[PDB]
Every structure is written in C-alpha cells, then in structure tokens.
Design a protein around this nucleic acid. Structure first.
Ligand SMILES: [Zn+2]
Ligand SMILES: [Zn+2]
Ligand SMILES: [Zn+2]
Ligand SMILES: [Zn+2]
Ligand SMILES: [Zn+2]
Ligand SMILES: [Zn+2]
Ligand SMILES: [Zn+2]
Ligand SMILES: [Zn+2]
Ligand SMILES: [Zn+2]
Ligand SMILES: [Zn+2]
Ligand SMILES: [Zn+2]
Ligand SMILES: [Zn+2]
Lengths: 162, 162, 162
RNA sequence: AUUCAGGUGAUUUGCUACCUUUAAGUGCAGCUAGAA
RNA sequence: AUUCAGGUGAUUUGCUACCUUUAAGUGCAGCUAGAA
RNA sequence: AUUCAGGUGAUUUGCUACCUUUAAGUGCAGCUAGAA
C-alpha cells in the first residue's frame, strides 16, 4: 500500500453527497492530508483511507474496532503513530488521486515518520484490507452508523466529471 | 467441557466390574466428587474423567504423562489446581450423569475455584481430548496398566438398568 | 543425518573431473575430513557435504546464502561451530563412504564438538536438505558458479570402479 | 583447501524472516517522537 | 482413594516439545569453545 | 475535522486474541490459593 493525496475538486464533489467525507484542505494543515493506498478493492471500487494524527479519544478505540486501524512503530507500541480512519475511507478515481513523491521529499521529521508508518502498514496490509472489507459489509448491511456513506458514495462518485 | 456428578448407584455398578472406578461418596468429601464433561467421545462412548485435589505425588507426574491432565490457573503455574484423572475416566449414561448447577451455586471459594479450573480446561479442550484418546488406545492395546478397564467397562456399562 | 569419511581413491577420482571436489587428505589435518550424511537425495543421487572449521570470511556469509550452512551450538550463537560447505557437496557411492565410529571415539574435545554440531544439524535437517536442493537446481540451471560440478560429477561418479 | 550466489521494503544499519517450484521484506535491535 | 505408561536424540542431567492417525528428540537451561 | 460497531467464555473488569464467509473466548493483567 502507499501514500496518496486527492484533488480538492473531487473531495468537494463527494462532499455534496456526504459531509462525512474527509476534509482535504485546512489552514492548520502543515502538509496536505494523506490517504492510504487501496485499503479495499471490491466490485471494481478502489478505496483510499484518510490518515489522522493522534487525538485524545484514540485511547478508547480498541484494536478490534472496525472504525480505525491504529498505527505505531514496528515493535515499539508506545510510539503511537496516529491511525487510519476506515470509517471515512472513500472510493476514488485514479485520475484525481496522486501518489506522494516520497522519492523527492527532503529528509524531514515528517518524511521520516511516513516511513515508520509505511512499514507498519506494509506488514499489516491484510489486517487492514480485512478490516475495510468487513467495515463496508456491515455499513452496507445497515449494522453500522456514523461512517461514510459507502453505498451512496459508490453510486455517485464516477459521475464526477459531469 | 463441563462439570458433572454421577449417581451413586451407577458408580457402585461399575465398581462391580472394576474397583479402579473412582469413589463417588466419602465422609471426608466436602462437596460431591465432580467429573469433567466428555473428555472423549468415540464408538458412541461418552467419557467423563474424575477431578482430584492436590496430592504429594502430583509433583512427579510430568506434563507428557497420559495418566493425568494437570490443572492450574491460566498463566499462573504456581497456582496448582489439582488434576484430571484420565487413568480413571469412565463411560457414562446420560441418564445417570448430572451437570453441576453452576448458575445457582452460592459465591464461595469452591465455586470460585471451579471457574478458574473451567477456563483452563476450556482453553485446553484439545490436549485433554487428545490425551484421553491416546490413553484409551494404549490401554486397549495392552500397553498400559493400572488404569480403569476401558474394554470391560465399555462392554458392561449399558447393562446398568438390569 | 550423520558423520562420514570418504575413501581417498574415490576423492582423487572425482578430482579428475572437478578440482573443486574437497581435499580428502592434508598434512595439517588432525582428524580426517568429515562429511555430513545425505544432505540431498534426488534422482537416486546421495550427496554428502564437507564440514569445515572457521575461517575469517565466514563472517561475511549470510544465513540466506546457499553456499554454506553455518553451524553453531544450539541456542548459543556466539559459539560458532564452522559450517557445512554445500557449494562442494558431492555424490557418493555407499561403498566408498564410511560412517564415523562415534560409539568408539575416546572422549576428547573433538568428539565433544561433533555432538554439539550433530544436534544442531539434527534440529535443522530440513533447512539443510532444503538448501542443498535449491543450490543444485540453481547450479544446474546455470544461475550459480564456483560450486562443484553437480551435473558433471553426477554423470561420471558411478564409473568409479573402472 | 576452493577466500560474501542473486533477489523481496517508495526507506532498510546489524542480525534475523522470506524468494529463486520466478517469486519473496517478517521479526528483534538501532535510529527516530515527526502529525494529517 | 487408586502411590511417575513407553518411547523418538550414533551423545542428552532437569524440564519441556513430540509420537503411541506408525510414529516421534524441539526449545530452555546445564555442560561444552573443541576444528575439517 | 468528523468524538468506543456488535458478538464469541455455565463466570469475565482492563487490555488483548478471535468472529462478523454464521462464525469466534485466546493471551497478559488484575482478582484469587478455594479441594474431589
Ligand atoms: Zn467491539
Ligand atoms: Zn500493536
Ligand atoms: Zn485390585
Ligand atoms: Zn513418559
Ligand atoms: Zn501450564
Ligand atoms: Zn545473498
Ligand atoms: Zn543460527
Ligand atoms: Zn522419554
Ligand atoms: Zn535430559
Ligand atoms: Zn473521528
Ligand atoms: Zn465484544
Ligand atoms: Zn470485559
């Protein structure tokens, strides 16, 4: 899996249909909001999930939860690295999605953390995909609330360019 | 698996054929003798094994032994909890066997220990069933002595009601 | 697996076809050169690999390498015990191969080390056989150089007695 | 005797794990404490 | 209540693993630093 | 940004494991040392 950004246009568009769709731009955002790379591929839908830095309430989110996949350094649990917000993953269009230029990022604390994250994500691909799959099923079945509207998003998203 | 008692009649009856069959009633017995719940099911035989509180010689009984399955609190080895005496498991008749009313036992040290035991037994079902299976095979094969007479008990036990 | 020696004749013979074939006798050799016992059995070929005591360059040989299987005491990694030189394993003829008389070796530092080695080898039989298998395939495929000439050795070796 | 097989990580120092049936990057150290 | 089943290690003290679906000696200690 | 999905244990607080393909209760804490 990999790190992506998403065009602001395309994020506004999904926001017409679901305010739950993650904010793309914010004055207080140092770097751009980043997404994780095809957490879920099903019925020809490619999903990307939002990354998000630590909040207070992440302490209550237990590992079993389908809402989030908690990140942290490999083998170093006390090094919390934020989480993947699956509850807000969205379907994407290859053309409005862009991979982070990791090969060109200046060596900074951030790019550094991205690699810590990346590796933990790489070694947990499956748990992630597995979680995303189930989250959607449930969401769709009407057994889970307060997530992104998968059903509706999946319906409207490709009508972006019109 | 679960906790059972066995009618005294039926225990006397098997004792006609094998004195090795565990004692059901004793003046020094606080609670009734308790048995563990289908350690072995084979050729339509349901086996229950006797529970037994610590004796001195349980220290010499090594884990590999087929005679006994040593109990102790989950993850707390120094908390020895007696053992399951497979060498004396017997085949039973659903109608002379009775489940302990755990849902109605007053909160006492005993009921408390039963749950410690139960869980350790639950998480080791397989080893237990596995041990019981092998113990019988061997016993039947004539490669093990000083156990209950499985072959003979299996033959005679259903003729209980006559 | 076990410890063997190989007749000097048969070792000279293979040396007619491949100088890479391990030296059998040397003035500086305390004990005879020893071989490990059927590292590989395939298309009716029985392979024995040479043992060899620590050299400087064994530090660069990584575990993944097909060239050698590094020995050392069980659970005691700092106790390097030389390595098995698979890159030089050779096919053998039961009649020119001989098992070391371990049962009759006087208790010496050497015989002592042999058992340390033996056990580590016994507990890794598979990795060894697995490595040998792959090493040959590759060697045969022409993807590996500087080893014994398996293809050529396999062809010529049985013509020993002529 | 025969003096480091080639690969798997958007990164990879040490070891280890895995792939070479054409496929494969885990784990324990170290380093880091980044922020959406 | 009923006082430790045998075995698998060219060697193996304790425990463990494992085998007794015809099979099975792993791991931790302990001892060992040996040489091709 | 967006502030804990429900389950699997004759019992189970905290975490965790597992299940969510109709399935699934593990492990570490803590509590506890009961007796056949
Ligand atoms: Zn939950
Ligand atoms: Zn974790
Ligand atoms: Zn008698
Ligand atoms: Zn035994
Ligand atoms: Zn235990
Ligand atoms: Zn290499
Ligand atoms: Zn090693
Ligand atoms: Zn034994
Ligand atoms: Zn021993
Ligand atoms: Zn949130
Ligand atoms: Zn739950
Ligand atoms: Zn709870």
């Amino acid at each position: 899996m990999k790190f992506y950004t998403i065009s602001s246009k395309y994020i506004e568009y999904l926001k017409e249909f679901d305010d739950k769709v993650p904010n793309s731009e914010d004055p207080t955002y140092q770097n751009p909001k980043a997404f994780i790379g095809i957490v879920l591929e099903i019925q020809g839908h490619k999903y990307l999930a939002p990354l998000t830095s630590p909040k207070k309430w992440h302490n209550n989110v237990k590992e079993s939860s389908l809402s989030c996949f908690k990140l942290h350094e490999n083998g170093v649990p006390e090094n919390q690295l934020g989480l993947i917000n699956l509850k807000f993953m969205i379907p994407i269009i290859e053309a409005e999605v862009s991979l982070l230029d990791l090969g060109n990022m200046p060596n900074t604390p951030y790019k550094r953390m991205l690699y810590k994250q990346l590796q933990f994500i790489r070694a947990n691909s499956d748990k992630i995909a597995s979680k995303s799959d189930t989250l959607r099923n449930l969401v769709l079945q009407g057994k889970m609330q307060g997530t992104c509207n998968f059903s509706l998003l999946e319906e409207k998203y490709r009508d972006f360019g019109k």
